[PDB]
């Protein structure tokens, strides 16, 4: 490691010495033991910690604060790693591993509010990384351009209710793009976290969303992961979202080679996404409990679920409507994963109903 780099380690970590209102888990868990033992340490591609920790530095807001520029920094800067994933996660010790994929019985999962007076709508993704690239910040632009080619050429092959186009960003109209990023649907552009983890190099190349006619079914392409497949409506059928991810998922793992790792499941460019990289959540009203932020937090956390803001995570709430999810992806199955919202939902909907 050149002595650059080193210093801007140093006066990094002793940015977040002096800041007593940062509160992400890189704080937390980069003592100066773990610090010293890591800081000399490179990857086989040449990432640093310094790749690793810059967006927690510049971004003292953040919640975790680390993202992995390769595959190999997970376990060379482990001594970081291990426990912020075991924190965020919910218990992941050394000695665990993540269980093989498995979607459950899919018929157990309910509609989740029947009468419709609180969700509006409902959403599962999963991530996906393509064996043979690194992570953002490691890419090149001829790299973007390799995958999309790849991505949309695999896609086009999609049938029946999954059919649809590949809409590349380079090209699209800025009004196009607003409405689909308005409505929920495609990534916004110059999300600051991802910046600073120099992670957004050469926008737009390479980056743009698949998706069938109904938008029912959507695929991004080089935002925060090399893929990111959805499946969404309106109401919450739950079953019917699920399925049609379960159906397009197994359809795309036949066609394309992805990284999975022993121990750490699916591999994804953050590591509160790995494992089962799913992500199940509602847009709900809940006028009672959602009276202040900070209680409906408090519930929700000890479902395991997580609140974010209507137009995403770092977003607020319009309207009183609020993005609730399973917080926790790795270690348990898709199916606990989807089953931790569920069930956490449900309750929290007759506790809306029941409160004075
Ligand atoms: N249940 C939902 N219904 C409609 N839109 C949703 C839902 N959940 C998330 N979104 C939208 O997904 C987009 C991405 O949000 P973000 O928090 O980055 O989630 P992620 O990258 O995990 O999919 C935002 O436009 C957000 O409003
Ligand atoms: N898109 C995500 N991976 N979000 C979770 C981490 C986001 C951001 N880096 C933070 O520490 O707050
Ligand atoms: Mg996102």
New binding site residues.
């Given amino acids: 490691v050149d002595q650059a780099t080193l210093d801007k380690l140093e006066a990094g970590f002793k940015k977040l010495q002096e800041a007593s209102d940062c509160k992400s888990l890189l704080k937390k868990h980069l003592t100066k033991d773990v610090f010293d033992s890591i800081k000399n340490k490179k990857t086989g591609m040449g990432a640093t910690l310094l790749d690793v920790i810059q967006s927690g530095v510049e971004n003292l807001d953040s919640g975790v604060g680390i993202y992995a520029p390769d595959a190999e920094s997970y376990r060379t800067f482990g001594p970081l790693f291990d426990p912020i994933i075991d924190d965020y996660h919910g218990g992941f010790k050394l000695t665990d591993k993540h269980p093989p994929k498995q979607w459950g019985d899919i018929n157990t999962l309910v509609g989740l509010d029947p009468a419709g007076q609180f969700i ?4 599962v ?1 999963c991530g996906r990384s393509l064996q043979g690239y690194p992570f953002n910040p490691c890419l090149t632009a001829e790299q973007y351009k390799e995958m999309e080619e790849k991505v949309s050429s695999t896609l086009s092959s999609m049938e029946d209710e999954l059919k649809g186009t590949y809409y590349p960003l380079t090209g699209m109209s800025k009004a196009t793009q607003q409405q689909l ?1 308005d409505d ?5 552009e110059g999300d600051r976290f991802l910046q600073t983890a120099n992670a957004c190099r050469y926008w737009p190349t390479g980056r743009g969303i698949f998706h069938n006619d109904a938008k029912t079914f959507l695929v991004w392409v080089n ?2 992961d090399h893929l ?1 497949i ?1 499946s ?1 409506q309106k109401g919450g059928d739950l079953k019917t979202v699920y399925k049609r991810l379960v159906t397009a998922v197994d359809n795309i793992e036949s066609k394309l080679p992805f990284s999975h790792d022993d121990r750490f499941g699916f591999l994804t460019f953050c590591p509160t996404n790995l494992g089962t990289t799913m ?1 199940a ?3 709900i009203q809940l006028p009672k409990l959602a009276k202040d932020r900070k209680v409906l937090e408090d519930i929700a956390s000890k479902f395991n679920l997580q609140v ?1 803001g ?4 770092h ?1 607020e709430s319009e309207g009183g409507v609020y ?1 609730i ?1 399973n917080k926790r992806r790795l270690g348990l199955t898709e199916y606990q994963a989807v089953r931790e919202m569920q069930d956490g939902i449900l309750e929290m909907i007759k506790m809306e109903k029941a409160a004075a």
């Fill in positions: 509006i709508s409902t959403r993704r990023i929920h649907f495609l990534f916004k935002e925060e990111r959805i969404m992500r959540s509602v847009h974010r209507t137009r995403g995570e977003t993005d999810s």
